[PDB]
């Protein structure tokens, strides 16, 4: 609840201050790209990162299209899998939070295919 | 005495997890440079 509230407070300050654009849009998306692109973080930081990606818009979300495949291949361990035993295969997370991640990674991906 | 340090270096780079973390970090630095 706090991640979903603070993510919708970041979008409030990207519109309250549009005169500071190109001075807190690339800074915040660089913070999110820096915090997101690793393996050794806890699940909630990844959830906050993806919701902060969701409260951005446009090509910046497309800017995270390329580096999502290797992110999934490192954080979800599909080492040669054939998508069949996915319910009881995986290693860091539990099943519920992996389902939350696969839900939220397309909750923001719908913005790039609706235009 | 550098043999134990070389073995500690080999202990922290071997496996699948380190090279994939490097592949994430170089993708971060390439996209961060190419953000503008």
Residues 6+ away with beta carbon under 8 Å from A81: A89
Q: Which two tokens stand for residue B11?
A: 């202990």
Residues of chain B numbered 4-33 and touching chain A (CB < 8 Å): 16-17, 20-21, 23-25, 27-28, 31-32
Count of CB atoms within 10 A of residue A46's CB? 21
Helix A43-54, helix A95-107: angle, nearest 10: 10
Q: Which two tokens stand for residue A55?
A: 């409260």
Q: Is B26 helix (H, G, I), strand (E, B) or coil?
A: helix
Experimentally, the structure was elucidated by cryo-EM
Residues in chain B: 36
Taking the C-alpha atoms of residue A75 and residue A70, their distance in angstroms, rounded to an integer, is: 8
Rounded to 5 degrees, φ, ψ at A45 are -70, -35
CB contact under 8 A, A74 and B24: yes
CB contact under 8 A, A26 and B35: yes
In chain A, breaks (C-N over 2.5 A) are found after 90
Which spans in A63-111 are helix H?
69-75, 95-107
């Amino acid at each position: 609840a706090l991640r979903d509230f603070a993510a919708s407070l970041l979008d409030y300050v990207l519109k309250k201050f549009p005169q500071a654009y190109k001075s807190l849009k690339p800074r915040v998306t660089r913070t999110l790209l820096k915090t997101f692109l690793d393996i050794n973080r806890v699940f909630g930081t990844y959830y906050g990162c993806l919701k902060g990606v969701s409260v951005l818009e446009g090509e910046s979300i497309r800017f995270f299209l390329g580096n999502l495949n290797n992110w999934a291949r490192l954080v979800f361990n599909e080492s040669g899998i054939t998508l069949d035993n996915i319910e009881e295969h995986l290693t860091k997370f539990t099943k519920e939070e992996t389902q939350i991640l696969v839900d939220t990674v397309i909750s923001a991906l719908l913005v790039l295919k609706k235009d | 005495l550098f043999k134990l340090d070389l073995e500690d270096l080999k202990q922290q780079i071997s496996g699948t997890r380190f090279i994939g973390n490097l592949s994430l970090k170089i993708r971060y630095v390439l996209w961060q440079c190419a953000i503008d």
